[PDB]
Amino acid sequence: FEHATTVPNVPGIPYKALVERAGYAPLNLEITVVSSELTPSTNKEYVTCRFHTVIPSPQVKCCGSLECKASSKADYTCRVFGGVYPFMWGGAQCFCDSENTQLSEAYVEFAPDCTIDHAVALKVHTAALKVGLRIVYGNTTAHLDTFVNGVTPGSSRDLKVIAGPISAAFSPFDHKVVIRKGLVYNYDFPEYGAMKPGAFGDIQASSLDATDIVARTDIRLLKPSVKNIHVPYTQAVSGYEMWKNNSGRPLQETAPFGCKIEVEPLRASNCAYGHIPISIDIPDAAFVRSSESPTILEVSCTVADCIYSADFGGSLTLQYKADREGHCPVHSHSTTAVLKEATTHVTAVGSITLHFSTSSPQANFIVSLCGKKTTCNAECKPPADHIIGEPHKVDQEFQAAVSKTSWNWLLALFGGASSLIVVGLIVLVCSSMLINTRR
Amino acid sequence: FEHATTVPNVPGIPYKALVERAGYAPLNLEITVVSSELTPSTNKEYVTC
Amino acid sequence: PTVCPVPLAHTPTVTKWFKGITLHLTATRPTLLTTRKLGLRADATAEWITGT
């Protein structure tokens, strides 16, 4: 048998439904989203970290000339200066006071500690939502991992299910992402090749060990002034450190819908949003025909004190008269009320006490036991507490969200005007007819 | 579960109430003022004889 | 990499009220507090708190 439904994508909160096959007895179906995983597809644009500004030892053409070559190092910078006459320790290095040029050379590499202290830049694409699901029907429970797309089916050894698509697609990750020691940030990093000094991604490479490092750190060489040998240079601060200071909080503390961000691979687990349409082919073997199941003869409902809150703060009793001892599934046919128990032992005659949670100010909902339906009417008070450490298990609607006192008052006030306008219309009509008749 | 009552200040006479949490059975609460002392803020001004 | 020990701050005192909470906080040193809503808008707030 195939059944279609819409489950709320909220982890940990059970959703209950009743499948009513005409030939067979009704059967329960309870569904729990054990875990979810919204994972995107990502490609590594580059990696960045603190750059080590390495300065090769300067050379001097002692009484000649030099020309700057064209190397392919990261942010390579080479300059040639005129006569310097440098000192090392012995008071002289050359014999020509003039025409004693010097070559100042400098570039950048990855710091030795970047193997741990580095940030990886990624771009995200459309994300596929995967769900781990626990579903129980009658006696049989089943765990299954499935893809919420509407095409890919999940299977557990006799049971086939298809889920999705999500009602409203959502992704906490912006187009561009940065990963830093597992922390996730949504930063619009510069594209590969578009280095800018003093900001994030001023040094880029395909990998830590990649030798084709490209960087733009605004390094510039100055003329050596003091007598002793040295190569002066001024360079913009590391933009990696600048971003680190101004990184802000990671995505683990800012993602909405209570979605837990994780890495390796990038993913968002336990992300509660939207509804999943599920079509499931529950096998007919588990079904039990009504001729063998106990069909109760007459049942009535008496509701005790009830309260509308996330917790199970409502209680009721079903006084039932049946014909056999069995295991009736009890259910609620309202979207603003959910029971605790699913299958209840039914005797020939007796009573069963049950619990329920509702979101409406009133309990005005139909309860079914082995098919027989009875309307329970109650009046639930506002909750005494203010906060719970548990989620609201039922959505709050508009129709079944106002008490019958308020409903009666509003309907009376509006029907007063409606009655008034219709009596005015019939008064006008009867006056016209009387004028015509007695004319 | 916070329950608020207005217990009469009478020693020796129990005050009985029923707390009814919605999803739980009612419970009985007996509240008995066994002793009660009212002490004022005192300060010796002097003695005499 | 290895495992480092870090302190645990004094547990907050939560006072409830209609659609809201009040956290009384005590931290002799700067302690980070990060709150966020679980709806469409995160409304994320981060603050380093000292004293009481």
Swiss-Prot record, chain A:
It comes from the Viruses. Interacts with spike glycoprotein E2. The precursor of protein E3/E2 and E1 form a heterodimer shortly after synthesis. Processing of the precursor of protein E3/E2 into E2 and E3 results in a heterodimer of the spike glycoproteins E2 and E1. Spike at virion surface are constituted of three E2-E1 heterodimers. After target cell attachment and endocytosis, E1 change conformation to form homotrimers. Interacts with 6K protein. Residues 13-408 are extracellular. This is Spike glycoprotein E1. N-glycosylated. Glycans are attached at N139, N245, N270. Residues 430-439 are cytoplasmic. Residues 84-101 are annotated as: E1 fusion peptide loop. It is found in: Virion membrane; Host cell membrane. It is a single-pass type I membrane protein. Class II viral fusion protein. Fusion activity is inactive as long as E1 is bound to E2 in mature virion. After virus attachment to target cell receptor PCDH10 and endocytosis, acidification of the endosome induce dissociation of E1/E2 heterodimer and concomitant trimerization of the E1 subunits. This E1 trimer is fusion active, and promotes release of viral nucleocapsid in cytoplasm after endosome and viral membrane fusion. Efficient fusion requires the presence of cholesterol and sphingolipid in the target membrane. Disulfide bonds join C49-C114, C62-C94, C63-C96, C68-C78, C259-C271, C301-C376, C306-C380, C328-C370. The chain crosses the membrane at residues 409-429. The chain holds residues 798 to 1236 of 1236 of the full protein.
